[PDB]
Structure 1
Amino acid sequence: LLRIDDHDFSMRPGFGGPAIPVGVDVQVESLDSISEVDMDFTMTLYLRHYWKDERLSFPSTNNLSMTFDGRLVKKIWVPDMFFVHSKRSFIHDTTTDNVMLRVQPDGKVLYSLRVTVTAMCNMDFSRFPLDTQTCSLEIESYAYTEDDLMLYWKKGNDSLKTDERISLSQFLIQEFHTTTKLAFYSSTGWYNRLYINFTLRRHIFFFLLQTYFPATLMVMLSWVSFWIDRRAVPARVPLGITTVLTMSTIITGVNASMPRVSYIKAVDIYLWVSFVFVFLSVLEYAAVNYLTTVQERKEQDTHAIDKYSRIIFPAAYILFNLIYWSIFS
């Protein structure tokens, strides 16, 4: 039906003349995973192309579109899109190549394929884990400059659809939209580039329950010492030491999961402030013990330091929490 043997498909339509326009639209099937250690995400989508080539015209009386097997895609000419700044990708091939080709009697062509991509995304963790991130996926032609191929969104802002099933267990997904920009390479020229943009927001419940509550409970345990007879030395000393030693484990367990950045995160501040709060309660009792021994040496109830600590330590911690949650909201 299609006159495939007649023509040299190594050359584009309009070869030697003005640029060929090619339109694009997209449907996202899933957003698959995200990594902070590697700074990347994975996405699966359907991608579609539109153009006209009169070498693929055929006669009919119905003026309708026809579908063809799919093994003809490797005989005709086809555009050459690639994903910019991507780590890896593939096209699906079970039970056969997931490819579709439809042609109109005047030579208009529709071409579609299903693909999975993993792409680069630079992340900022200064407000972690109360953070927000923004991402994009880039599309461009490899071989043809804007003097030979013209690339655009087919229907404007309506060119992007999203599956209603899309979900991530740790993030809220929002603000899908599309943009365009021109790009330059020194050795080869100017190119059109298409963008798909979106925003992510992290859920905090896991981190409350797994980090912020136990640190608070250790701080509250250290306060119990102020309520115990100053004469019970082998009770008051280990009570403080054990809380110091636990707070160290919590600090280690948090930071072992993240990338080794060169700046402080919002969770680090909270944990290290709680550490100094616990550390100071040990020096307090050391002072009380020394001053009591001096009194014994002079001579040979509740001490004022205990009496004041019972008020001062909790008030200070409450002030710190008010400030912190005013800053990070």
Structure 2
Amino acid sequence: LLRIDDHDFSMRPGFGGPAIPVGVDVQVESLDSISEVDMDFTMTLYLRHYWKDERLSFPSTNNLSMTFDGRLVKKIWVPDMFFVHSKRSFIHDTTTDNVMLRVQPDGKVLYSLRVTVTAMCNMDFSRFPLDTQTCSLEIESYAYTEDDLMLYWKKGNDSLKTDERISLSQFLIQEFHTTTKLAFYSSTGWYNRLYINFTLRRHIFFFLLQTYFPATLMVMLSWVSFWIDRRAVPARVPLGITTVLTMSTIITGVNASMPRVSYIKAVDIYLWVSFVFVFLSVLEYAAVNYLTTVQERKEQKDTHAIDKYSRIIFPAAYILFNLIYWSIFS
């Protein structure tokens, strides 16, 4: 039917003349996974192209598009859009190459693909786990410049669609929108680009329950030593060192759960402040015991004031620190 053998398809339509417009339509299917260590995300989507080529015109009276088996792609001219800043990608081939080709009698062509793309996304972990991340996906032509191929969205803001089943266990996805920008390369010239933007928000309940509660509980447990009688040395001494050991074990367990190795985080600040409080509580009893021993030795030849002042100083200081910490990071 088509006069494929009568023309050479190694050259774009309108070779040597003005640029050929190409439209893009995208439908996002699902998001597979997000890796924070490698800073990338995986997305599966449908890609569509629109253009006109008079060399594919065939005589017909129905004036309706006809579907071909997709094996003609290797013989006709096809746009070569590629994903920028991508690490790995492939096209599904079960049970065959997922390629759709529709040609109208007047020469309008529709081309579709189903691809999986992995792209990088820089993340900021300063406000972890309260941080908010933004990522984007870029589409650009490889060989043809702006003077030979024009790339634009088919229907503007209506060219992007999202499946209702898109969801993530640890993140909340919202605010899908599209924008365009012009890029420049030193050795080749100017190219057009297409962007797909979205915003990710992290759930806070799990991190709070797993991290902040044990530290506060351990601090309150360490606060108990201020009320036991100072004469019970074999009871006062082991409590502080056991609290230190338990805090060390908690810190060791928390670190192995989530690897970041980037910079300081608010969770580390909280944990180290709690550790410093525990250390000061441990030193306080040693100071009290030394003073009591010196006083008894001097007397030889009532509750101590240090404990009474500590019982007021420590809780107020911890409350002030909590208020400052939850006001700085909101």
Same fold (TM over 0.5): yes
Alignment-derived partner of residue 295 in structure 1: 295
Cα distance, 1:253 vs structure 2: 2.9
Q: Tell me, in whole angstroms, the C-alpha distance in 2 between the residues paired with 1:266 and 1:57.
A: 64
Cα distance, 1:260 vs structure 2: 4.9
CA 1:267 to 1:308, structure 2 compared with 1: closer, same or farther past 3 Å?
same
CA 1:250 to 1:326, structure 2 compared with 1: closer, same or farther past 3 Å?
same
Tell me, yes or no, if the aligned pair for 1:36 and 1:258 is still in contact at 8 Å: no
Which deviates more from structure 2 when the two are superposed, residues 242-251 or residues 11-20?
242-251
Q: Tell me, in whole angstroms, the C-alpha distance in 2 between the residues paired with 1:274 and 1:161.
A: 48
- What percent of counterpart residues are identical? 100
SS for the counterpart of 2:257 is coil
Which deviates more from structure 2 when the two are superposed, residues 78-87 or residues 307-316?
307-316
Q: Tell me, in whole angstroms, the C-alpha distance in 2 between the residues paired with 1:137 and 1:319.
A: 44
Alpha-carbon displacement from aligned partner over 1:37-56 (angstroms, at most 9, x marks no partner): 11111100000000000010
Q: Tell me, in whole angstroms, the C-alpha distance in 2 between the residues paired with 1:119 and 1:258.
A: 22
Q: Tell me, in whole angstroms, the C-alpha distance in 1 between the residues paired with 2:105 and 2:194.
A: 30
SS for the counterpart of 1:140 is strand
Alignment-derived partner of residue 111 in structure 1: 111
CA 1:259 to 1:144, structure 2 compared with 1: closer, same or farther past 3 Å?
farther
Q: Tell me, in whole angstroms, the C-alpha distance in 2 between the residues paired with 1:58 and 1:51.
A: 16
Which deviates more from structure 2 when the two are superposed, residues 134-143 or residues 228-237?
228-237
Tell me, yes or no, if the aligned pair for 1:80 and 1:142 is still in contact at 8 Å: yes
Cα distance, 1:314 vs structure 2: 1.0
Alpha-carbon displacement from aligned partner over 1:46-103 (angstroms, at most 9, x marks no partner): 0000000001001111100111111111111100000000000010010111110001
Q: Tell me, in whole angstroms, the C-alpha distance in 2 between the residues paired with 1:28 and 1:250.
A: 42
Cα distance, 1:258 vs structure 2: 4.5
Q: Tell me, in whole angstroms, the C-alpha distance in 2 between the residues paired with 1:109 and 1:240.
A: 77
User: How do 1:1-329 and structure 2 match up within 5 A?
Assistant: 1-300=1-300, 301-329=302-330
Q: Tell me, in whole angstroms, the C-alpha distance in 2 between the residues paired with 1:271 and 1:185.
A: 48
Q: Tell me, in whole angstroms, the C-alpha distance in 2 between the residues paired with 1:99 and 1:263.
A: 46
Which deviates more from structure 2 when the two are superposed, residues 195-204 or residues 261-270?
261-270
Cα distance, 1:257 vs structure 2: 4.5
Tell me, yes or no, if the aligned pair for 1:37 and 1:258 is still in contact at 8 Å: no
Q: Tell me, in whole angstroms, the C-alpha distance in 2 between the residues paired with 1:253 and 1:126.
A: 21
SS for the counterpart of 1:302 is coil
Q: Tell me, in whole angstroms, the C-alpha distance in 1 between the residues paired with 2:255 and 2:106.
A: 62
Cα distance, 1:261 vs structure 2: 4.2
CA 1:260 to 1:207, structure 2 compared with 1: closer, same or farther past 3 Å?
closer
Q: Tell me, in whole angstroms, the C-alpha distance in 2 between the residues paired with 1:255 and 1:101.
A: 52
Structure 2, unaligned runs of 5 or more:
none
Figure out how many residues of one structure are paired with residues of the other and give that number. Answer: 329
Structure 1, unaligned runs of 5 or more:
none
Cα distance, 1:249 vs structure 2: 2.5
Cα distance, 1:256 vs structure 2: 3.4
Which deviates more from structure 2 when the two are superposed, residues 247-256 or residues 149-158?
247-256
Tell me, yes or no, if the aligned pair for 1:7 and 1:55 is still in contact at 8 Å: yes
SS for the counterpart of 2:146 is coil
